[PDB]
Write a protein that binds this ligand. Structure first.
Ligand code: CLA
Ligand code: CLA
Ligand code: CLA
Ligand code: CLA
Ligand SMILES: CCCCCC(=O)OC\C(C=C=C1C(C)(C)C[C@H](OC(C)=O)C[C@@]1(C)O)=C/C=C/C(C)=C/C=C/C=C(C)/C=C/C=C(\C)C(=O)C[C@@]12O[C@]1(C)C[C@@H](O)CC2(C)C
Ligand SMILES: CC(=O)O[C@H]1CC(C)(C)C(=C=C/C(C)=C/C=C/C(C)=C/C=C/C=C(C)/C=C/C=C(\C)C(=O)C[C@@]23O[C@]2(C)C[C@@H](O)CC3(C)C)[C@](C)(O)C1
Ligand SMILES: CC(=O)O[C@H]1CC(C)(C)C(=C=C/C(C)=C/C=C/C(C)=C/C=C/C=C(C)/C=C/C=C(\C)C(=O)C[C@@]23O[C@]2(C)C[C@@H](O)CC3(C)C)[C@](C)(O)C1
Ligand code: KC2
Ligand code: KC2
Ligand code: KC2
Ligand code: KC2
Ligand SMILES: CC1=C(C#C/C(C)=C/C=C/C(C)=C/C=C/C=C(C)/C=C/C=C(C)/C=C/[C@@]23O[C@]2(C)C[C@@H](O)CC3(C)C)C(C)(C)C[C@H](O)C1
Lengths: 171, 155, 213, 219, 168
């Protein structure tokens, strides 16, 4: 059932301490979609932190506000310092991708994963498709595992940058 | 076909197809020219590299510039070099005239039992000859532009 | 459809498309899509121009006596009043009209009410009621009080013809007002009221200048 | 075909026959056959005539003082049209030259399914954008020829008469525009226009800043 | 392979193989695949070169030291310019870059030879429909052709003054 799916690998194998899919195996696809979603957002967030450490874009963030890309710090302060119009455009783009471009759920309120699709197969036709079954399974496992490590790491960076103001903790 | 010039990075490299629809005589002429250019360019590149920083002959103070050094060489030395090269070239012509004649083989390899090892080492000769062909022209061009030798240009 | 409709609007002139705009295949969507888009554009422009004519005439003489409108004079250009309006009010007005427009564009809704998109067999200008909206919607855009919801079928097309002609007249009228406003003496016999000097097609000129200009 | 050229010579002028003293009609260019050479020559003639016909009206409308009242043009105060070109920004100059270049590129690529003019195609034919929507970069919309489709559905006889008129008026507009610039550069070269085209001391065949005229041979 | 079989016949030249000098008339299957491999490698290198030139010319650069021994900063390299910055880079760093690129090229040539595999080093495929994939191949070739032209234009524009007018 659930014990042999993409994610039941690594040192722990199948890992359900609080028996979620054991109690409700029907919800495993929804949980996989959510895990892929959070993992991917966290991969992006961790790379954003690590790369904002050393590389910054050129030019002004907002010429009317006289806010420059290099002037921003690296952390939550940068998102604070983005102008309100920038934040609104950011939310608009994220919402467009969430609702229309890459739809994680099909419909109603308690969204189910799409019918003729994997738990998190949100890309359209123009996307890398692996046809070797072994490579497909291996790389999907790599996707979800890197996502998990990324969300643990990103929570770490967020807490460090909340406590101190820098994602790098001293040491 | 029947030669050993093909290699991995470019395969059988003939974009303009000179060898295509050509006689074995013309193919042998091409390979002889290729190997002669490669060998002469090896000699040239090694000569510039060594003579740039180690030139004990002719008082030990002839110019390290390759283009100036040959002009500084006495006339008799140039005549002797030309005589030596011509004496090699008459034997090249006679080897061409011989009934058995592979293009660049003064060794007469055909009478011995050769193998893919011999083919691979002929390929090594040819590839090094191509690299030296580019190298010698590069060295001479840099000598004309900057006036420094190869190793002094690198300095 | 355009020939018969044009003869209905004005049978003496019949059809006058001097630039053959119906013939030009807009976005390669077909001549039928060109006709639908053009008719909907004419109706949209006519409605907004009719309203803008009445609103300009009203705003040149009356303002709301509560803030922030009470602070605006009426003896200036209505375009100047819009220019003075706070940036948030400008954005909010534009966002509300954007809501009305995107609701009109939503295919599922007007399909619920039994219409298609204007460039595929959709009768031009069928705005939908706000029933698919989530929380309570006490009134609607068209027939808000449901007064003439049970209108007459032939009246329901005579009104369309009258709407088209009145919209054309209001297009030329509101634009004459803007012409005299930004260029004094532009419309002769109109040079009596308001001569503001600024682009009326700059919603936020007073607020910010877009980069690159 | 040379016989077709002789036939068209009657249409353009019944009295003046196939007046080609240099015999360029019988020539062969770039190792191509005489039909392809005639296609090239006819397209060159029609394109020159077209540009001269659009240039005569431009020269009149510019020298007479009518001018676009916007920024880069209202910055150009001079009236001599050559001087106006010389006073244009180099960005505007290149954006004209390369825009016309794109139009030439489209005129040369034949993807609508007709031969190119040196391969049996009609000389003087610009392919229509609307013919092949997939073969276009975004969507041009309005064709370079007859954008608003007023000549649509015309008879082949009317179109051929239009071709004859095009070639003849083009031939005459060549001499018209070159007479204007002739007065502009070398005064007293086109007698009737004496005092109607201002003198110009630059170079009307150098789009950008240069000071090499035909000063060694002039007047 | 006939030259008509390969992808690259562009709409901008009437969907015909464009050979003014007829270079590929006397070309073989292996030679043609090798030449296409060279074309694609140039295309990809030119794309990356255009992006790198844009970044360094607009001033994008890391925050740090490219070499503590020589005291050369990313800012020091970038301020000189896209072209002189390359000269200002430490020689050992250039040799590290060349060595890494050469190692990858050796490995990918051995695994995916140019003659046997023409500019197809086996990276994952975005589409399996043959018509779509031919379209993506053509788009690659067009983008990389324009990228070659663009990077050489940038080089000459910065080297020789005022060569390209619209060089940003
Ligand atoms: C967004 C969070 C999230 C979600 C939705 C899931 C979902 C899933 N994980 Mg888990 N996982 C997560 C985070 C998450 N994971 C993280 C951060 C790690 C790193 C330690 C892992 C590591 C991991 C492994 C190694 C494995 C799973 C597996 C699974 C599946 C098993 C069913 C289950 O119990 O899931 C339901 C889980 C939730 C609904 C999350 C509840 C979180 C609560 C609200 C808070 C917990 C307190 C605090 C944050 C800690 C399911 C797809 C197993 C699998 O794929 O088996 C086939 C499996 O082997 N996960
Ligand atoms: C001038 C020297 C020369 C000559 C005579 C040849 C001859 C030959 N080569 Mg070539 N080759 C050379 C240099 C030369 N090569 C160099 C330097 C390289 C390295 C890139 C190669 C790489 C190479 C490979 C990888 C292969 C061959 C092969 C061959 C053979 C078959 C193809 C053919 O018909 O070529 C005929 C060649 C010519 C008629 C020479 C024409 C030279 C033109 C006019 C000059 C072009 C260069 C340009 C002007 C300047 C370059 C930049 C700079 C130096 C200024 C033939 C014996 C193939 C072979 O042996 O297959 C079994 C084969 O696989 N060659
Ligand atoms: C870059 C733009 C561009 C391009 C691609 C073309 C292309 C063409 N024009 Mg030209 N043309 C242009 C601009 C351009 N034109 C402009 C601005 C005008 C004025 C309105 C004309 C007016 C014109 C006429 C009236 C005619 C042509 C003709 C031609 C053809 C051959 C020309 C030739 O071989 O010249 C080669 C010229 C040179 C190599 C000289 C130097 C070019 C400079 C240095 C290039 C600049 C950089 C470049 C864009 C990269 C060809 C279809 C003739 C034709 O179709 O005959 C059948 C023809 O009759 N053109
Ligand atoms: C393909 C051509 C190319 C070449 C020859 C170079 C060469 C150089 N780049 Mg790089 N660069 C390139 C593409 C290229 N870049 C691309 C595509 C990017 C975008 C990610 C960058 C982004 C970049 C930055 C942000 C910086 C450089 C810089 C440099 C210099 C130091 C090496 C370095 O930090 O590299 C880093 C290169 C990469 C991470 C690109 C990896 C390629 C991918 C597959 C050196 C002159 C530094 C500088 O300012 O020097 C002028 C510098 O700070 N480059
Ligand atoms: C065009 C849109 C493309 C979007 C997708 C994309 O680009 O995908 C790109 C992609 C894969 C791919 C594909 C390509 C083949 C390349 C492209 C194809 O695309 C198309 C469109 O065809 C298909 C695709 C997508 O499959 C891969 C992305 C991978 C990514 C982004 C992976 C991040 C891991 C991070 C982890 C594990 C962090 C751990 C973090 C941890 C543990 C920490 O935080 C630790 C730490 O910090 C702490 C807490 C404090 C510090 O003091 C110390 C350290 C540092 C120790
Ligand atoms: C100077 C010179 O020489 O010349 C000119 C120049 C120039 C500039 C052109 C001029 C102008 C301006 C002009 C003439 C502008 C004209 C503007 C115009 C024509 C403005 C229409 C508004 C209509 C509205 C708001 C309709 C609401 C309609 C509503 C709210 C309805 O209830 C719809 C309705 O269907 C229902 C649902 C039920 C049906 O039972 C019927 C009705 C209708 C009740 C000049 C200065 O005057 C003279
Ligand atoms: C008229 C005048 O005078 O001036 C004009 C013309 C002139 C001179 C030409 C000029 C110029 C320059 C121009 C126009 C330059 C154009 C340059 C151009 C067109 C540059 C494309 C780059 C593409 C990139 C970087 C793609 C990367 C792709 C990446 C990062 C990938 O790895 C993709 C991929 O990972 C995926 C997603 C997964 C797999 O499926 C496959 C792989 C692994 C491969 C001027 C000066 O500007 C303006
Ligand atoms: C191609 C290679 C080569 C060979 C195979 C070769 C063989 C022999 C043999 C027989 C085995 C003899 C007997 C012999 C003798 C002399 N060689 Mg000689 N030689 C070669 C090359 C050069 C060059 C480049 C120079 C040179 C010279 C001299 C001088 C000095 C004369 C002097 O003191 O002026 C004498 C006496 C130099 C010269 O002529 O200087 C003016 C000079 O520059 N050789 N050389
Ligand atoms: C600024 C707003 C505005 C103005 C100033 C305005 C003025 C006039 C006048 C002129 C004096 C007439 C006589 C008239 C008549 C009709 N209007 Mg109209 N109208 C406005 C807005 C809308 C909207 C949003 C809709 C609409 C409609 C109808 C229908 C229904 C026909 C049918 O359903 O058969 C008829 C008969 C509905 C529709 O679909 O019209 C295409 C619809 O939804 N109108 N309308
Ligand atoms: C500024 C430039 C310019 C001028 C000033 C100008 C003047 C005249 C006059 C003079 C009074 C006549 C009478 C005339 C007539 C026709 N022109 Mg013409 N023309 C210009 C430009 C083009 C272009 C770009 C095209 C074109 C064409 C046709 C056709 C179509 C025939 C057919 O479809 O069979 C006919 C009948 C198209 C074509 O196919 O020409 C072979 C075409 O592409 N023209 N044209
Ligand atoms: C394709 C590009 C590339 C790759 C993949 C790559 C990988 C690695 C790896 C892992 C495999 C290690 C372990 C490593 C180590 C060092 N790199 Mg290196 N490096 C690349 C590029 C450059 C450049 C451009 C420079 C550079 C340098 C140094 C220095 C010396 C610093 C100093 O002495 O201050 C050290 C210790 C700088 C240098 O040597 O400057 C004199 C310098 O400028 N690297 N580098
Ligand atoms: C210290 C301190 C304070 C404090 C504090 C506190 C409360 C600190 C708490 C810190 C805390 C709670 C730190 C957790 C880290 C967890 C990590 C790194 C886990 C990574 C785990 C990963 C990356 C897992 C990966 C895998 O899932 C993958 C991807 C696939 C599987 O196959 C294998 C496994 C399961 C391995 C005060 C009170 C504020 C002040 C005082 O003065 C000083």
């Amino acid at each position: 059932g659930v014990e042999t799916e993409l994610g039941a690998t690594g040192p722990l194998g199948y890992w359900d301490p609080f028996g979620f899919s054991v109690r409700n195996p029907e919800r495993f696809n929804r949980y996989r979609a959510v895990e892929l979603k959070h993992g991917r957002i966290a991969m992006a967030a961790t790379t954003g932190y690590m790369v904002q450490s050393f590389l910054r874009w050129p030019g002004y963030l907002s010429t009317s506000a006289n806010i420059k890309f290099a002037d921003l710090p690296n952390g939550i302060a940068a998102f604070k310092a983005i102008p309100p119009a920038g934040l609104f455009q950011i939310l608009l783009f994220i919402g467009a991708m969430e609702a229309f471009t890459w739809r994680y759920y099909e419909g109603p309120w308690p969204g189910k994963v799409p019918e003729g699709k994997a738990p998190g197969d949100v890309a359209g036709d123009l996307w890398v498709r692996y046809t070797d079954p072994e490579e497909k399974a291996f790389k999907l496992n790599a996707e979800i595992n890197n996502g998990r490590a990324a969300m643990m790491g990103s929570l770490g960076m967020l807490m460090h940058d909340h406590i101190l103001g820098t994602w790098v903790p001293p040491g | 076909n029947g030669m050993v010039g093909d290699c991995k990075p470019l395969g059988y490299f003939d974009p303009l197809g000179f060898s295509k629809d050509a006689s074995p005589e013309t193919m042998a002429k091409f390979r002889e020219a290729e190997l002669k250019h490669g060998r002469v360019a090896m000699l040239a590149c090694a000569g510039m590299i060594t003579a740039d920083k180690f030139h004990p002959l002719f008082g030990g103070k002839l110019s390290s510039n390759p283009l100036l050094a040959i002009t500084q060489v006495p006339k008799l030395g140039l005549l002797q070099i030309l005589l030596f090269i011509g004496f090699m070239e008459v034997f090249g012509i006679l080897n061409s005239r011989r009934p058995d004649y592979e293009p660049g083989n003064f060794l007469g390899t055909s009478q011995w039992e050769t193998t893919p090892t011999w083919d691979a080492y002929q390929l090594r000769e040819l590839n090094n000859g191509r690299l030296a062909m580019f190298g010698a022209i590069g060295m001479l061009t840099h000598a004309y532009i900057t006036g420094k030798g190869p190793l002094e240009l690198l300095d | 459809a355009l020939p018969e409709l044009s003869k209905k609007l004005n049978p003496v002139l019949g059809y006058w498309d001097p630039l053959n705009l119906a013939e030009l295949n807009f976005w390669g969507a077909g001549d039928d899509a060109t006709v639908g888009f053009l008719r909907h554009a004419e109706i949209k422009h006519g409605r907004v121009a009719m309203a803008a004519f009445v609103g300009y005439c009203v705003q040149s003489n009356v303002h709301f006596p509560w803030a922030p409108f009470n602070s605006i004079p009426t003896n200036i250009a209505p375009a100047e009043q819009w220019a003075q309006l706070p940036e948030a009010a400008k954005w909010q007005i534009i966002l509300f009209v954007g809501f009305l427009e995107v609701y009109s564009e939503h295919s599922f809704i007007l399909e619920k009410y039994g219409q298609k998109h204007y460039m595929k067999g959709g009768k031009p200008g069928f705005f939908p009621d706000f029933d698919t909206m989530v929380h309570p919607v006490p009134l609607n855009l068209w027939d808000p009080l449901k007064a003439y919801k049970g209108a007459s079928a032939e009246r329901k097309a005579d009104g369309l013809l009258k709407e088209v002609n009145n919209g054309r007249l209001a297009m030329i009228g509101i634009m004459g007002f803007c012409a005299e406003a930004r260029v004094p003496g532009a419309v002769p016999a109109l040079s009596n009221i308001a001569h503001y000097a600024g682009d009326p097609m700059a919603p936020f000129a007073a607020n910010f200048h877009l980069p690159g200009f | 075909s040379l016989s077709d050229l002789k036939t068209l010579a009657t249409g353009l002028n019944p009295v003046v026959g196939y007046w080609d003293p240099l015999k360029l009609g019988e020539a062969e260019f770039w190792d191509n056959t005489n039909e392809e050479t005639i296609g090239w020559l006819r397209h060159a003639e029609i394109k020159h005539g077209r540009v001269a016909m659009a240039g005569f009206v431009g020269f009149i409308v510019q020298a007479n003082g009518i001018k676009f009242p916007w920024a880069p043009f209202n910055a150009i105060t001079s009236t001599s049209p050559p001087e106006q070109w010389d006073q244009l920004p180099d960005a505007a100059k290149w954006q004209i030259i390369l825009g016309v270049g794109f139009l030439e590129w489209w005129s040369e690529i034949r993807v609508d399914g007709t031969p190119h003019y040196m391969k049996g195609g009609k000389p003087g034919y610009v392919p229509d954008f609307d013919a092949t929507p997939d073969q276009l970069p975004h969507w041009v919309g309005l064709n370079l020829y007859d954008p608003l489709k007023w000549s649509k559905g015309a008879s082949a006889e009317k179109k051929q008469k239009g071709l004859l008129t095009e070639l003849n008026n083009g031939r005459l507009a060549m001499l018209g525009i070159m007479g204007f610039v002739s007065e502009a550069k070398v005064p007293g070269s086109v007698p009737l226009l004496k005092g109607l085209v201002a003198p110009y001391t630059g170079e009307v065949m150098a789009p950008f800043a240069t000071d090499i005229d035909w000063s060694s041979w002039a007047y | 392979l006939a030259v008509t079989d390969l992808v690259g016949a562009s709409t901008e030249v009437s969907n015909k193989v464009w050979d003014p000098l007829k270079l590929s008339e006397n070309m073989d299957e292996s030679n043609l695949k090798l030449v296409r491999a060279a074309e694609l490698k140039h295309c990809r290198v030119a794309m990356l070169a255009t992006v790198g030139w844009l970044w360094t010319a607009t001033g994008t650069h890391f925050e740090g030291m490219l070499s503590t021994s020589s005291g050369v900063s990313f800012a020091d390299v970038a301020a000189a310019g896209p072209l002189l910055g390359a000269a200002k880079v430490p020689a050992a760093g250039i040799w590290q870059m060349i060595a890494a690129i050469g190692a990858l090229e050796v490995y990918w040539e051995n695994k995916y030879p140019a003659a046997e595999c023409g500019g197809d080093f086996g990276v994952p495929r975005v589409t399996q429909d043959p018509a779509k994939f031919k379209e993506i191949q053509l788009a690659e070739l067009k983008n990389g052709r324009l990228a070659m032209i663009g990077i050489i234009s940038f080089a000459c524009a910065e080297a020789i003054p005022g060569s390209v007018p619209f060089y940003p």
